[PDB]
Amino acid sequence: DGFVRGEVASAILLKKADTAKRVYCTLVGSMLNNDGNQTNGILYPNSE
Amino acid sequence: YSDNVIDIDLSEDSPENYLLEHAVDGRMLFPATGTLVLAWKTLAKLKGVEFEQLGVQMTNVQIHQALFLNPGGKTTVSVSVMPITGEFQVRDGESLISSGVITSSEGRLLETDQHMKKGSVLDGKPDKELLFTKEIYREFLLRGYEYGAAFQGIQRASLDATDTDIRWDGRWISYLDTVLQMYLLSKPGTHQALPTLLESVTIDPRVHPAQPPEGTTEFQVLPGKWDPVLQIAAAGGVEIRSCHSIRASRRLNHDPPILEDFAFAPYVDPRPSDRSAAAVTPALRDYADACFEFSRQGMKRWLENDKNNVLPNKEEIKEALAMANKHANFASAKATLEALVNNKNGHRLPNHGLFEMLDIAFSEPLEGDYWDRLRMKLHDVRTYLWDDPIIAALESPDIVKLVMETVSDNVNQQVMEILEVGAARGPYYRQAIPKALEYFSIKDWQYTVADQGFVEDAAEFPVKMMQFDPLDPANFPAELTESCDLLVLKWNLQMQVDLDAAITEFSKMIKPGGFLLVLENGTRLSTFFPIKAIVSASLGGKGGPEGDRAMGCFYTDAQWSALFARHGFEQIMHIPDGIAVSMFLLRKPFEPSVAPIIINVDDLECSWLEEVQARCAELQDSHKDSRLWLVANTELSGVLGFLRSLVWEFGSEKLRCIQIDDATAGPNPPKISADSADFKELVRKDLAYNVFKNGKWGTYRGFVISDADRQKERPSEYVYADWLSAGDMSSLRWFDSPLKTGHNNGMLGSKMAHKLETETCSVYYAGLNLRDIILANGTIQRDILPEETFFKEGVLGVEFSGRNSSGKRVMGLCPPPALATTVKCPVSSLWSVPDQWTLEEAATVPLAYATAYYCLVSEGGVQKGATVFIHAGASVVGQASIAVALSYNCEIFTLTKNSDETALLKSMYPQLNDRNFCSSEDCSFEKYIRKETKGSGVDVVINTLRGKFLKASRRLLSKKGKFVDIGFKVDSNTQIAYYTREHPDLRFQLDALLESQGPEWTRLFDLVQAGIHSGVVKPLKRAVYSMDKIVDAFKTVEAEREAGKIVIKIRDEERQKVCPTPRTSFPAIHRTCFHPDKSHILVGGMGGMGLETAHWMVLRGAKKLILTSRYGITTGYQARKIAFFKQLGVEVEVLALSVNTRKAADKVFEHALKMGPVGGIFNMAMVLYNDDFLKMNREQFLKPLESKITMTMLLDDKSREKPVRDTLDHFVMFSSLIVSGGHLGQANYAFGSTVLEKICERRKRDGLPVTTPQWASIADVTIICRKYPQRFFNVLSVFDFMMSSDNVVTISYVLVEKSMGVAAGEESMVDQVLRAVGKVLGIKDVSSVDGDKEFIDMGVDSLMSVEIKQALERDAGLVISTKDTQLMTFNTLRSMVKG
Amino acid sequence: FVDIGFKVDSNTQIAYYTREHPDLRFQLDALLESQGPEWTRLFDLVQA
Amino acid sequence: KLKGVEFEQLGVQMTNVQIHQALFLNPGGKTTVSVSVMPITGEFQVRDG
């Protein structure tokens, strides 16, 4: 029925894989988008 | 970017929602002992300890305002506590609600040992020696305290209310209130007391039981005790000490009741004495003649001056002028009317419209564009014709209600359909709606106005506007066939060219059995013609067999009636105005196909109940034309109210009634018997109720009583001045004085201990003091006065100057009300007027000098040569004080407002020099007086000013000086000082000495008498006001703009000096009073309204009650009430008998005459068996008929015989609105209630006293038939009017709201819900926004959609999903609530 | 009410200063300085 | 300050001012005193600690 607020102060370091002395993983890719004018309100997730 | 801010969440499920269950006269209130908990919790919070581990003590808690709670709202209050001293303040916003001092402690604060008591001492007692929660909170409800289940803590108590069982539920605001209820339960009465000061409140949770376990359903009861010696209400760990309350005016939860006069009204040709007759006064018959002469000669002026021939219908005007001459200067004509209009002789018509409008018609110049301009001019003042005495004579409230309700009784539907054709020229909705249709509760009505165009004036009325041609038949829309139950044609058939065609087409719009109402000019047809000549276009109308239309648009009344009769129309009603208009109510004849059934219901033993039941069962299986005629040929018969209740379960289609009153039936009584002649005339009209009384057929109708008649003033031998509304000096009136009975109201309690010898004096002049103004304007409540005046009729006036019983001229002070025409002055307070003063001068002496001697010689102990400082030297007490002080050879310093007062005093007292005067504007007298007294100070200070003036006054006192403070507007701290005995209250001491009349008073009596002889006591200058300017006199005293005594002149002093006072009458409002030396029987007085009405009589004079019941005292509420009457000094007697046989009747009157002469008989007894008429046998049908048909004729037979007949004053027989509206299942009760009303109407016929209240519903002792139950305190207010009135039966009922239409109401609900939806979004005006814009386009977001859905479910039957909500429109919302 | 206590509160003392109440706890000492009509009444009462 | 006006534009009147103790100043020291005024009635209290 909801969420509980939390606290974090995390940070990460990214480097070119060829010059990295330690590699937890590789960033294949990230992207962003927006929902637009949805009829269920601004504070409503858009599955599409 | 003071102390704890408390938020009270009055929400649906908030834990403190129980606080909405505490209301006073409807308003929701925060409990007075609710700010104590807030202060208690705040102090604990400051200390850091838990509030339930802290023992506090609040002292001198002042309640300044009332915190009005609001449902579904948040109230924020700030509590501020001073750290060390404890001064606390509960303040909402910037307004104080509570103030006081809160102190915590670790020791034992509680005084009484109640916290140690464990059990309940009310164990094993009988149920008649205990008060239960229903009985405890019935008493509070009667006083306006409405407590819900949360605040109903006192679960049981003793008759004395000393011992109680208090519920502990863990809510402290509830618990503290329930401990304050014990104090309230210890002061029985009728008024509403608002707490204003709690001297001490001790809360010690340590000795208090812990909060009940979570989810507890049954809570424990803690013993409680009330201590009269110390005035402590203690229960558990709480103690409330010396709570002081202020009388509060009880506000009306609902709108004022609608009082009506259930009277008989003839149908056709009413005589002038009948209630259906036109209200043509002699003045109106003159205005009609004056208008006729003005109209006649004006036309003559028109014809001769019309040299341009710009006056079409000229032949018509000539014809109109001719007839006026047949049945018969312009300057004089206007002169006569102007004299009538400008005169203000009381006889004054409400307005003169016909004259005004006629003047515009004739005075307008004859030139180009005349008729077009003048047509527009009259169409701009059309209202004058509508609202004119001549036109309004037939539009009186009585006739309009008679017609509308008579039709309603006969239409056999649920919705009454009306249709006013031609509503632009002659309107009727503006009269029918506000006068008759707005009083409907059982039957709905639909009104439809129609005309050629839009009816402008009907925009504000709940009517539907149609459109078609009224002046031309054959074009009436076919949608109007069988469309209206009633058709109104006010001034319509006079505009039709072809009457027969119009009437034939109009008759089609009438439903089968509908009515047609026609209002047309029938007499003096040439009076209104000048207006119609130039307001009508085609003044031409074909005549016919009945004759030729006058001019071309008027038929005579006789011709009107013949014309209607020719088309087979039965004349249901016909009321000729006589001076102008006439009214006809017609419906088509009814031709039965099956012989009507007649059942005689004369027998009062109900030997016909079987026959009616059988024939009533076969109603819904017979032909539609079959009728059941319940016929009664006796004055006493309940057929009228019996039928009304039968109609509620069998419909009005077939039930019909006929009653013939034998007593008033004319020399030719009707002969209704099967195949008779009169009956057939009645089977043709087919009217539901036919009553032959006073020689004419009619019906019983409830005619409304105007709110102005409730305060109508009538001559009365004894009157006294009181206020209609407390705290208003403009509401002062003269009411009937109980001295007509010889005694004075308020002989209960302490007034019974002092048996002072009193002389009855005829007051001639009454002096007005500042004590009366303070009480009249609400500055001080009646409760501050001596306790002997609590039950007195009034508290205004003490001094007077009149004539004693021997005719001697006397003046003196008496306990109030002395602002009356007769007084009972103790012989120890009466001085004799010297034979040099007129009674006018004597009226100024007594109080002014009695107070002066008390302040100076009795309280100040003035000695010869002493220095005295007198505030307000120009006041009557000030002038008396100076005169007394001068006689003692004192050094006087006085405060004068302006130079006029200084000049007046200097002239009045030559010994006074300018050095003896100071100013009341500022405290600069302190330095002057101190310097002038060489630092010695003033021996006596008569103080009236307050604030810094009071402080500076005490600072002038010498070492032995006395400070006499007699000001009335004391501060809150000063009053607490009075309560705590810290200081003496000397401002109502002269009033207190007048109640005791003991050694201290006789000292003042001798001092004043000596002063009169020695010349010290001289009369003061005065202004005399008549008895009708009482209000102005009070305002004059209050303003204090000028010095002098204000003296009301009651009577005119005779030239002689010892002569009897002539008997005279004064106009005064009614006030019922009961003789204290007579015995009053209250049969059934041991019940709900019986005991509460009995308490009302006890306050109004009754002191000899014999209450009768079938069982006597059977509950603790009855035992507690009767023990309250006896304590007050009332000789009560409770008889466990039923007055149903002559033996029982004799016993009740043997006991009554033993107590004293019988002076009143009341019958409040009721027995009800509610059941369907067909499932009731005789033994069950005669159940309610004993208390209403056998106990009313055994009390009426005994009241018509000696010695009761001469002594008896009141004969009250309570009734019900079932006799006027009917009810479902109460067909036996209706028969009993109607026969009771017929006995009471027979008593009026014989000149005996009789009163028959007809109550709808009573609250304190919900919505039934759309009528709110009245509060009892308002039932007794109208009951008092009922007793002091000439009518027999009075109907009192409260309407939920003035009736609207059917569609009108439906649209109202639609707009209501639409607005609720709009506000959910946040739109102030729902109609402002577009109706085709979706909600999502506005910003609806998740939370609102759910709110909208819930609101729709709670408001209407719609259940809409959230998704569709954000995509539907307002127009869609409206159309779907419609579906 | 004859109050002859000596340990009056602060409010009580202000009442004495403001002439609101008479200070009767040092009156026998004041009558002994003046020795006037009021004292001679007490002198006779005690002697009697 | 409670009224929000400047103190040199306000005309006050203190009545029956009781001095219960002496606030002993100390050189080179800081003294903190709490003043509490009741909003409507004006009862004030200068209290150190």
Ligand SMILES: NC(=O)c1ccc[n+]([C@@H]2O[C@H](COP(=O)([O-])OP(=O)(O)OC[C@H]3O[C@@H](n4cnc5c(N)ncnc54)[C@H](OP(=O)(O)O)[C@@H]3O)[C@@H](O)[C@H]2O)c1
């Ligand atoms: N209060 C209302 O709701 C209301 C509404 C409309 C009209 N009224 C009118 O007011 C009256 C009802 O008031 P109420 O019922 O509140 O209080 P009430 O009139 O005092 O109650 C009826 C009392 O009559 C007594 N009674 C019945 N038969 C009797 C008999 N043969 N002899 C003597 N006493 C007899 C009963 O006493 P026991 O119980 O001891 O047998 C009962 O207490 C009726 O006149 C009614 O028309 C009341």
